[PDB]
Ligand binder design. Structure first.
Ligand SMILES: CCCCCCCCCCCCCCCCCC(=O)OC[C@H](COP(=O)([O-])OCC(O)COP(=O)([O-])OC[C@@H](COC(=O)CCCCCCCCCCCCCCCCC)OC(=O)CCCCCCCCCCCCCCCCC)OC(=O)CCCCCCCCCCCCCCCCC
Ligand code: BCL
Ligand code: BCL
Ligand code: BCL
Ligand code: BCL
Ligand SMILES: CC[C@H]1c2cc3[nH]c4c(c3C)C(=O)[C@H](C(=O)OC)c4c3nc(cc4[nH]c(cc(n2)[C@@H]1C)c(C(C)=O)c4C)[C@@H](C)[C@@H]3CCC(=O)OC/C=C(\C)CCC[C@@H](C)CCC[C@@H](C)CCCC(C)C
Ligand SMILES: CC[C@H]1c2cc3[nH]c4c(c3C)C(=O)[C@H](C(=O)OC)c4c3nc(cc4[nH]c(cc(n2)[C@@H]1C)c(C(C)=O)c4C)[C@@H](C)[C@@H]3CCC(=O)OC/C=C(\C)CCC[C@H](C)CCC[C@H](C)CCCC(C)C
Ligand SMILES: COC1=C(OC)C(=O)C(C/C=C(\C)CC/C=C(\C)CC/C=C(\C)CC/C=C(\C)CC/C=C(\C)CC/C=C(\C)CC/C=C(\C)CC/C=C(\C)CC/C=C(\C)CCC=C(C)C)=C(C)C1=O
Ligand SMILES: COC(C)(C)C/C=C/C(C)=C/C=C/C(C)=C/C=C/C(C)=C\C=C\C=C(C)\C=C\C=C(/C)CC/C=C(\C)CCC=C(C)C
Ligand SMILES: CCCCCCCCCCCC[N+](C)(C)[O-]
Ligand SMILES: CCCCCCCCCCCC[N+](C)(C)[O-]
Ligand SMILES: [Fe+2]
Ligand SMILES: [K+]
Lengths: 301, 281, 239
């Protein structure tokens, strides 16, 4: 049997890697965490260090407040009973204010107010985290591709719980915080808007989601296939093309008639993934604001 | 025409069948025995679809639809115009996909690389086969398979899903979706990271793998590494498809009631089933 | 209709994006050439993108692409047919000449450097602090080829310091010299390291490195290409 390089055969370890300095404020980096031999069979065994400045503290605090606000509501619904908490965990849900309250914040805590509070914490957590992706890249002198890509995901998220509800005139339009409940919300959304399979942006979003699995399967497999030539050392193959990048390119040129480059494949990758939520956000934002029924819309288009 | 660095790799050898008989290229495409097989299966399949289109009475891309035999036919054969064409086209598709995978294997052999790509492709093929072959056979009829139509196959997805209530409740489906979402997340991150290092701030030198590891450790306290991220992307995408095939192979076979009710086994656990309070009490 | 405008608009954007992506992926390997190395008549509907320049660290210079393409090495192959599209047969020993699956690229004859300017890959004995942390330590094990004959013994592991992983096994041959073998091409077993790609008699042929403590990108390519080439060309010797 041939070694497939899915799991490493032997792990090696040296002094903890503290990372590059560049313009980073080292005072904000923790010490290294423990080493995981388990993780090491697949990826890096090293945990940490992590960077936690003020913005990061805010993001984590806010994120946890979001999580705890939902959790306290769950215990409440569970009658504070531990056994009930676990058996009905997926049924609990923190719902938005009723339609009657519009976009106001005058709804009782048990009837929407608490949802607004949790949502506020989540809003701060996500945006401050986005700031983190931008600043950690800046401090290292790197491009801002990660922050820009993250924005696409944020777009769908914003449309779902903020932009669309506001355009629709009520918080009742937003997604509830619950495992099963957000799924019921999803099914209901499609039913009420004439079946999302008729929303062209939903179909595109699906093409890109499937396309992302197709592409990562292709790319991941390709790199592993040429790892025997150092193929995974992508930055250097970009700066100085080796036989790994050439064989990868030719496998595809010979298979489907065209190919990419070591750098270019990553551009196909970032866009394929980013377009999932980009088209999706548009599709959802237009739902109920401009198009009430996609089936009907499709009949006239 | 050839890429500037291509000629040195265009040597003889690697074929699985026919020796040097089909060992050549047509433009950029490698042929090989399976290249001829794929063309044969694909051409026939496409010709049979056009014929199905004639029997349907339309040439419109968005209207052409080849349906499998009605349930009454069970797993037997059917008249061409009544499901038979679907049956032949499905055989052609399977032949074309498998041949495409085998051609990839010959290409791997000539290039001296690993067989990871065709192996990964086999997962997609198996998912397709679960829907048109394994599931229908287990259920007792070809009619359970999806039709070959741009919009009609979506009708099948919607109809099949709602046959079990909100399909979101299928636990295997939840896992598959988790892998699909996580995969796209990982793809965006991988593409953005490599690009952010290769295309740093204006005027700066290319960043290094060290900078990539540093960026992620700074951000979330962990970096999987360059080898790991490619292993991950592959594992996430294949896992997503594996659980997709699984979520459908068990639907209509071992589980055929409303998926939401499956979750009753947990709620009805003796030690808390009758405890008052909560949503289920 | 706002939705109509949006979707119509998206497709325009997508066509433009695809055009952009395809041109970006033509920064290497183009213009296309005929089998004789001259420019091909048909280059396709996509034009070459404007050049971009990568600034390399540690004074290594820059890289501008697209740019004049050239193999920068002799290719020992000859046409086997009177028309295009057929295989090109090795004029000598393909393993030794570096063609077919035994191909190597004329990469820079310098070692890859980490973010601090130090050699990325180093034998473990010279990498302060590094050691095997899990799995069977291959050091000391005999190395068996596909012909089932012992070709040498493992004397060290060459590691990627930055990414902390094993990249090569250094194998000592009967004459006392050593060779590097890609980790991805060996099977570490309890009582030995097995190499399916090469028969015992082909280990001496593996390209050697200039300096015993470092390996250049050029040498890595020659070594990796040669070992992988063995799968096809050592087949007769493989049991
Ligand atoms: C309504 C929708 C609202 C949704 C809002 C969510 C927005 C999400 C945006 C996600 C963008 C991901 C982009 C990926 C990427 O490469 O990012 C890095 C890229 C470079 O980052 P860097 O760190 O500054 O540079 C590092 C290096 O110096 C330089 O590094 P580099 O070389 O890698 O970067 C150069 C980069 C330069 O970047 C750009 O030029 C920006 C691209 C932004 C695209 C935004 C998408 C908009 C979608 C519209 C859909 C319309 C439907 C309605 O080149 C490109 O990526 C080119 C993009 C291809 C565009 C093709 C356009 C075709 C138009 C059709 C023409 C007609 C012909 C057909 C017939 O980022 C940007 O330039 C900024 C993007 C900011 C967008 C803000 C949007 C406001 C909200
Ligand atoms: C897996 C679950 C369901 C299913 C659920 C859905 C849903 C839900 C949607 C689609 C959608 C699509 N499906 Mg489907 N689809 C199924 C199985 C298939 C099969 C098959 C042989 O297995 C094929 C070829 C397709 C193909 C397609 C594409 C036409 C379209 C875009 C997806 C995409 O880009 O993916 C990623 C792949 C790539 C980016 C590679 C390029 C693939 C090209 C786009 C596919 C060409 C298909 C072609 C027209 C078939 C004729 C070719 C022959 C010459 C005759 N589906 C199974 C039965 N499919 C979307 C749509 O808008 O449909 C109208 C959509 O919303
Ligand atoms: C019955 C249900 C309806 C339906 C209703 C909907 C609705 C409603 C929506 C979708 C959407 C989507 N649908 Mg649909 N959909 C249906 C059937 C399908 C089928 C199929 C085979 O049948 C498929 C493949 C899809 C596929 C898709 C995806 C393309 C798209 C989601 C993109 C994504 O990954 O966002 C992933 C990303 C996000 C949700 C971004 C937000 C992430 C935030 C920013 C991060 C949170 C961080 C947090 C604070 C901390 C978390 C904790 C830590 C992890 C520890 N649908 C049926 C017809 N679908 C979405 C869309 O865009 O539609 C156009 C959408 O809104
Ligand atoms: C646009 C898509 C719909 C939607 C449709 C679905 C469907 C359908 C499913 C989920 C599932 C999940 N959803 Mg949801 N989900 C939506 C928006 C969200 C948001 C958010 C802030 O926007 C969050 C935090 C979640 C979170 C979750 C996770 C609990 C779970 C696994 C996803 C995953 O693999 O993440 C990976 C990311 C990291 C590990 C980081 N969803 C929107 C409203 N979601 C799956 C599940 O198991 O649900 C019970 C599932 O099947
Ligand atoms: C109302 C509809 C129901 C529902 C009903 C179903 C049903 C029914 C099914 C799914 C399936 C899936 N659902 Mg669902 N699903 C719902 C809502 C969702 C939501 C959401 C946001 O709400 C999401 C994210 C999903 C997600 C998913 C995915 C896990 C899965 C589809 C991918 C797959 O299996 O690919 C597998 C990959 C393939 C099938 C592709 C095979 C490709 C072949 C090998 C090659 C094609 C070559 C081509 C012809 C050549 C073209 C020419 C060239 C381009 C030149 N569903 C709602 C609740 N869902 C499907 C599943 O699991 O299927 C196994 C499925 O059958
Ligand atoms: C791990 C699974 C993921 C994956 C992986 C994957 N796909 C792959 C590969 C890999 C590793 C390849 O190597 C191979 C490739 O060459 O990519 C460019 C491929 C590929 N994935 C493709 C499509 C594809 N993959 C998909 C999905 C996935 N691929 C998964 C997410 C999907 C969807 C719907 O999600 C699609 C549409 C092809 C572009 C390509 C394989 C090309 C091929 O096999 O060509 C041979 C055949 C023809 C050109 C002609 C077929 C004509 C007729 C014989 C049949 C058609 C009839 C009917 C089946 C069509 C019905 C259509 C309707 C439903 C609309
Ligand atoms: C292009 C769209 C895809 C995408 C991209 C994406 N997500 C991202 C990013 C990017 C580019 C980040 O940079 C950011 C990140 O930090 O990743 C490690 C993130 C992220 N995506 C996350 C979740 C997430 N992304 C999802 C989806 C997607 N993300 C899409 C498939 C999903 C779902 C529902 O599928 C989830 C649950 C977070 C883990 C992380 C942002 C962390 C955050 O906002 O924390 C704030 C609060 C806390 C401290 C938590 C309590
Ligand atoms: C680091 O490395 C890598 C590369 O290189 C540097 C790469 O390129 C790629 C490849 C990836 C890309 C180029 C990005 C774009 C690709 C996608 C988004 C995936 C989806 C793909 C498609 C839409 C293309 C589908 C086209 C096909 C299958 C070709 C079919 C057409 C034909 C005309 C030929 C038909 C048939 C046969 C039987 C062949 C034999 C021919 C004759 C008999 C004549 C990856 C993953 C990679 O990781
Ligand atoms: C405390 O108990 C112990 C066990 C510790 C812990 C228990 C906690 C548990 C069990 C927590 C469970 C949490 C769960 C299950 C959360 C699930 C969320 C899900 C399933 C989906 C989320 C969808 C949410 C979306 C799309 C939200 C979008 C939100 C926004 C766009 C922001 C909206 C902001 C608003 C309305 C406020 C206005 C803002 C300003 C600027 C003032
Ligand atoms: C960057 C990758 C390019 C992917 C292009 C994807 C094309 C698939 C289109 C199918 C969507 C069809 N539609 C109209 C129903 O939405
Ligand atoms: C779904 C869209 C993704 C497909 C993009 C197809 C690009 C075709 C590129 C052909 C370039 C051919 N070549 C060798 C002449 O350069
Ligand atoms: Fe990559
Ligand atoms: K040492």
């Amino acid at each position: 049997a041939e070694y497939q390089n899915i799991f490493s055969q032997v792990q090696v370890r040296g002094p903890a890697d503290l990372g590059m300095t560049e313009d980073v404020n080292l005072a904000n980096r923790s010490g290294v965490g423990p080493f995981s031999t388990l993780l090491g069979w697949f990826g890096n065994a090293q945990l940490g260090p992590i960077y936690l400045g003020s913005l990061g503290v805010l993001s984590l605090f806010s994120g946890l407040m979001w999580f705890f606000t939902i959790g306290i509501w769950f215990w409440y619904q569970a009658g504070w009973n531990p056994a009930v908490f676990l058996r009905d965990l997926f049924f609990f849900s923190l719902e938005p204010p009723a339609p009657e309250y519009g976009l106001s914040f005058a709804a009782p805590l048990k009837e929407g107010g608490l949802w607004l509070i949790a949502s506020f914490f989540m809003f701060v957590a996500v945006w401050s985290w986005w700031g983190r992706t931008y600043l950690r890249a800046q401090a290292l002198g790197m491009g801002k591709h990660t922050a820009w890509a993250f924005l696409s995901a944020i777009w769908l998220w914003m449309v779902l719980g903020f932009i669309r509800p506001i355009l629709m005139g009520s918080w009742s339009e937003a997604v509830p915080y619950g495992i099963f409940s957000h799924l019921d919300w999803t099914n209901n959304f499609s039913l009420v808007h004439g079946n999302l399979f008729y929303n062209p942006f939903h179909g595109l979003s699906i093409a890109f989601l499937y396309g992302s699995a197709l592409l990562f399967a292709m790319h991941g497999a390709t790199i592993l296939a040429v790892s025997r030539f150092g193929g995974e050392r992508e930055l250097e193959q970009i700066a100085d093309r080796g036989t790994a990048a050439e064989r990868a390119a030719l496998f595809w040129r010979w298979t489907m008639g065209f190919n990419a480059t070591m750098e270019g494949i990553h551009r196909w990758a970032i866009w394929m993934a980013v377009l999932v939520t980009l088209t999706g956000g548009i599709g959802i934002l237009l739902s109920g604001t401009v198009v009430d029924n996609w089936y009907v819309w499709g009949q006239n288009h | 025409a050839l890429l500037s660095f291509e000629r040195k790799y265009r040597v003889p050898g690697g074929t699985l069948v026919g020796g040097n008989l089909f060992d050549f290229w047509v433009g950029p495409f490698y042929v090989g025995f399976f290249g001829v097989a794929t063309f044969f299966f694909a051409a026939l399949g496409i010709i049979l679809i056009a014929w199905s289109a004639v029997l349907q009475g339309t040439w419109n891309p968005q209207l052409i639809s080849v349906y499998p035999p009605a349930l009454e036919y069970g797993l037997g054969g059917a008249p061409l115009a009544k499901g038979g064409l679907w049956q032949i086209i499905t055989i052609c598709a399977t032949g074309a996909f498998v041949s495409w995978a085998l051609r990839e294997v010959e290409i791997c052999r000539k290039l001296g690389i690993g067989y990871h790509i065709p192996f990964a492709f086999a997962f997609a093929i198996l998912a397709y086969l679960t829907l048109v072959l394994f599931r229908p056979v287990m259920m007792g009829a070809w009619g359970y398979a999806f039709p070959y139509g741009i919009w009609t196959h979506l009708d099948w997805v919607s109809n099949t899903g709602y046959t079990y209530g909100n399909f979101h409740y299928n636990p295997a489906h939840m896992i598959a979706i988790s892998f699909f979402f996580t995969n796209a997340l990982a793809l965006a991150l991988h593409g953005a990271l490599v690009l952010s290092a290769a295309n740093p701030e204006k005027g700066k030198e290319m960043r290094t793998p060290d900078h990539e590891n540093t960026f992620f450790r700074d951000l979330v306290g962990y970096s999987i590494g360059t080898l790991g991220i490619h292993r991950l992307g592959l594992l996430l995408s294949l896992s997503a498809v594996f659980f997709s095939a699984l979520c459908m192979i068990i639907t209509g076979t071992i589980w055929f009631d409303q998926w939401v009710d499956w979750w009753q086994w947990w709620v009805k656990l003796p030690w808390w089933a009758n405890i008052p309070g909560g949503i289920n009490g | 209709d706002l939705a109509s405008l949006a979707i119509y608009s998206f497709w325009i954007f997508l066509a433009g994006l695809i055009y952009y992506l395809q041109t970006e992926n033509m920064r290497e390997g183009y213009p296309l050439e005929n089998e004789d190395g001259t420019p091909a008549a048909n280059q396709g509907p996509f034009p070459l993108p404007k050049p971009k320049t990568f600034i390399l660290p540690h004074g290594r210079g820059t890289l501008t692409v697209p740019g004049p393409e050239s193999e920068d090495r002799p290719i020992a192959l000859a046409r086997t047919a009177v028309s295009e599209g057929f295989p090109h047969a090795p004029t000598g020993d393909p393993m030794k000449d570096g063609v077919g699956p035994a191909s190597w690229v004329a990469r820079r004859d310098l070692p890859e450097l980490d973010g601090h300017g130090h050699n990325k890959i180093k034998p473990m004995k010279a990498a302060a602090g590094f050691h095997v942390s899990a799995g069977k330590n291959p050091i000391g094990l005999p190395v068996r080829g596909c012909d089932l004959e012992i070709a040498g013994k493992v004397v060290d592991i060459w590691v990627d310091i930055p990414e902390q992983m094993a990249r090569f096994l250094e194998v000592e041959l009967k004459d006392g010299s050593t060779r590097l073998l890609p980790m991805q091409m060996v099977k570490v077993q309890s009582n030995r390291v097995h190499v399916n790609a090469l028969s015992s008699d082909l280990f001496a042929g593996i390209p050697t490195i200039k300096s015993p403590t470092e390996v250049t990108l050029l040498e890595e390519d020659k070594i990796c290409g040669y070992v992988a080439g063995g799968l096809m060309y050592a087949a007769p010797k493989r049991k």
